């Protein structure tokens, strides 16, 4: 008997756990991607042609 085929041992996920896990993972990915790629302020450029100096 093949007891690991798709027709056997399906455990539905409780709704509360499903909602919590989905929200947690979505929030984690969104926050990390935001702070890693969108909240990078040390890449600051100041455009000012009047700060040059020539003798």
């Amino acid at each position: 008997y093949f007891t690991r085929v798709h027709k056997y041992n399906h455990v539905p996920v409780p709704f509360i756990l499903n909602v919590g896990m989905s929200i947690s993972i979505v929030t984690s990915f969104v926050y990390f991607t935001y702070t890693s790629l969108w909240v990078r302020p040390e890449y600051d450029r100041v455009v000012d042609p009047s700060k040059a100096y020539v003798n």
Binding site: K51, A52, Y53, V54, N55
Partner: protein, 282 residues
């Protein structure tokens, strides 16, 4: 540059004013990108830059073999080669260059000449250089001794050997007893009479008549040679992409008074340079 005298060619004097003028407090540029530096950094844009030094050194070699190390374009190329070439390669290639390895006529670099023939030719050439330099040194010493005899020569000689580069050198000399008001006045009288003669119509006409022939002949020659230079340039341009090799364009780069780069800014248009034989100095 109030007290800077350009006619003076004393290495010590030029060094003092190099220290004064190229000081970093006033000469360092802020937020400036030089086109020459950018182009050199864009052609060889990786960390591995073993390939720039040989190319620029060979550019300088060709330039100074055609025109001599005293040419301003050659000096520019030498300055760049020194900047971008590591001192190990520079040392080895300067040792070879000192041995007539890069000579255009008998150097093994450009010719398929055997070791013994190259050796004898290089020895002859180096001995010739030694003798000519000895004669030139004697002539330079004799001319420098004679120069001090003249009024202006004496004043310039005393200015050159001043301990510190001052803004008002003649005033400091005359206020310290080194120079005499009488000698200064005599030199000024000589200069005034020369100036009056130059702007006098009759004497200027005499001078023009005396010097007209040579100038006219030179103009005729260098207007005739223009066409042939163009024909040679075109014929060589046919070789630009003939093969996979790269053709030389002696001089690679010249001193640009209209669009100065990093060399002109750092050396004040080729005025403050290392005083070594590679720059055409003794």
């Amino acid at each position: 540059m109030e007290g800077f005298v350009d006619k003076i060619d004393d290495n010590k004097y030029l060094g003092k004013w190099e220290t004064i003028l190229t000081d970093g407090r006033t000469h360092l540029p802020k937020h400036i990108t030089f086109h020459d530096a950018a182009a050199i950094s864009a052609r060889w844009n990786q960390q591995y830059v073993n390939d720039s030094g040989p190319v620029y050194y060979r550019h300088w070699l060709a330039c100074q073999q055609t025109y001599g190390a005293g040419n301003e374009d050659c000096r520019k190329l030498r300055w760049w080669a020194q900047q971008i070439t590591h001192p190990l390669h520079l040392a080895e290639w300067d040792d070879w260059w000192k041995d007539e390895h890069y000579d255009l006529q008998i150097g093994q670099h450009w010719n398929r000449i055997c070791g013994e023939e190259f050796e004898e030719a290089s020895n002859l050439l180096k001995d010739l250089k030694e003798k000519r330099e000895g004669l030139a040194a004697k002539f330079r010493d004799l001319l420098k001794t004679k120069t001090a005899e003249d009024p202006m020569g004496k004043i310039l000689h005393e200015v050159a050997q001043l301990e510190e580069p001052s803004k008002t050198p003649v005033a400091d000399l005359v206020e310290a007893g080194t120079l005499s008001k009488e000698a200064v006045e005599a030199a000024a009288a000589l200069k005034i009479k020369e100036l009056k003669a130059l702007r006098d119509d009759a004497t200027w006409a005499e001078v023009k008549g005396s010097l007209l022939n040579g100038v006219t002949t030179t103009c005729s020659t260098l207007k005739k040679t223009s066409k042939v230079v163009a024909e040679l340039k075109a014929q060589a341009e046919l070789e630009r992409n003939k093969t996979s090799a790269v053709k030389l364009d002696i001089p690679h780069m010249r001193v640009n008074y209209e669009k100065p780069g990093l060399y002109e800014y750092d050396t004040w248009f080729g005025k403050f340079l290392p005083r070594t034989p590679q720059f055409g100095f003794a």
